[PDB]
A paper describes a structure:
Dual-specificity phosphatases (DUSPs) are a group of protein tyrosine phosphatases (PTPs) that can dephosphorylate both phosphoserine/threonine and phosphotyrosine. Despite their various substrate specificities, DUSPs exhibit a conserved catalytic mechanism mediated by a catalytic triad consisting of a Cys, an Arg, and an Asp in the active site and a phosphate-binding loop (PTP-loop) with a “HCxxGxxRS(T)” consensus motif. As an atypical DUSP family member, DUSP26 consists of an N-terminal domain (residues 1–60) as well as a conserved catalytic domain (DUSP26-C, residues 61–211).
In this study, we determined the crystal structure of a catalytically active form of DUSP26 with an N-terminal extension (residues 39–211, referred to as DUSP26-N) at 2.0 Å resolution. To gain insight into the structural basis for the catalytic activity of DUSP26, we determined the crystal structure of a catalytically active form of DUSP26, DUSP26-N. Because the active site cysteine of the phosphatase with a low pKa value is susceptible to oxidation, we mutated the active site cysteine (Cys152) to serine, which does not affect the structure or substrate binding, for crystallization. Despite their close resemblance, the most noticeable difference between DUSP26-N (C152S) and DUSP26-C lies in the presence of an additional α1-helix in the N-terminus of DUSP26-N (C152S). Structural comparison with the catalytically active VHR and catalytically inactive DUSP26-C and MKP-4 showed that DUSP26-N (C152S) adopts a canonically active PTP-loop conformation, which is highly similar to that of VHR. Unlike those of DUSP26-C, which are flipped away from the active site, the backbone amide atoms of Val156 and Ser157 in the PTP loop of DUSP26-N (C152S) are pointed into the active site pocket. Together with the backbone amides of residues 153–154 and the guanidinium group of Arg158, they generate a positive electrostatic potential, which is crucial for the catalytic reaction of the cysteine thiolate anion. In the DUSP26-N (C152S) structure, the canonically active PTP-loop conformation is stabilized through formation of hydrogen bonds with the surrounding α7-α8 loop: Gly155-Arg186, Val156-Ile189, Val156-Pro190, and Ser157-Asn191.
Author numbering:
A (entry chain B): 41 to 208
B (entry chain A): 42 to 207
Write the structure that this text describes.
């Protein structure tokens, strides 16, 4: 009927972290939630050219408005569970983000359902691979602008990426 | 360097709170030092009591509070897992209770950053006066303000929870 401080901590980490539906966390890189992904007017207003859905649903498929908005789309199916292997998506998502930003005027929304875990993981991987931030560095840069908390398993995967990169 | 558990605390403690204070319970605002110094906001919100869980004894009661009629209790706590907040649980929950028992009463419980020292007394108040368990108190508050008491305060609230629930 009682717990230890570690389980309390895990519960506390499910508290409020997100303040807006999306935040620019890197020049031209917005990180946000499903609402922003479905907000045609805001996607219009912000000049969104690429969308990376890190929570792609085979049921809902590619949002129908993105064609009318000129949006290049990449959905990856992913589940926000410490047991899920998000690393299968690191390089394909990073490359996508790189070529979105590489384009003059390019602007990308990376999103999940909440915008704090699946999506945040791929952004942090993108900064590690393409800008050579440490895992801790990328976390500090992103959390300056959006309260992120990748699940424990995604953090363990990002730590392993951090290890492998810093060696080579 | 940093293990995953350290990465978690860095992410969740080092985020930027959406607001300088949040109503986490009816008439109970939990927030930071900025809000404590925000005369405009204090008046707009109708704050009638302030509990400074980060009180320094060489500053007194904030001077502006008397003219506003704001009643003050300062708790001289440090945000350290070695600091025993438990000796203040009751005196703090009492003050909060009197504030909220007053018609129109509204309290600001604050600390430096509004995540640990102040949050700890808010949780203790909810357990003592509304008989919530620690976990219930946390679920009540966490979606309004992303609190995270330091591990030692969590241990002292676990001690309280067990005592109150025999």
């Amino acid at each position: 009927p009682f717990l230890n401080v570690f389980e309390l901590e895990r519960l506390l980490y499910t508290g409020k972290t997100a303040c807006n539906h999306a935040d620019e966390v890197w020049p031209g890189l917005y990180l946000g939630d499903q609402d922003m992904a479905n907000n045609r007017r805001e996607l219009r207003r912000l000049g969104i050219t690429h969308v990376l859905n890190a929570s792609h649903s085979r049921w809902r498929g590619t949002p129908e408005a993105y064609e009318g908005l000129g949006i290049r789309y990449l959905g990856v199916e992913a589940h926000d569970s410490p047991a899920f292997d998000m690393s299968i998506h690191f390089q394909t998502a990073a490359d996508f983000i790189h070529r979105a930003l590489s384009q003059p005027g390019g602007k990308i929304l990376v999103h999940s359902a909440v915008g704090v875990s699946r999506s945040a993981t791929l952004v942090l991987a993108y900064l590690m691979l393409y800008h050579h931030l440490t895992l801790v560095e990328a976390i500090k840069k992103v959390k300056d602008h959006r309260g992120i908390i990748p699940n424990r398993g995604f953090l363990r995967q990002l730590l392993a990426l951090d290890r492998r990169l810093r060696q080579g």
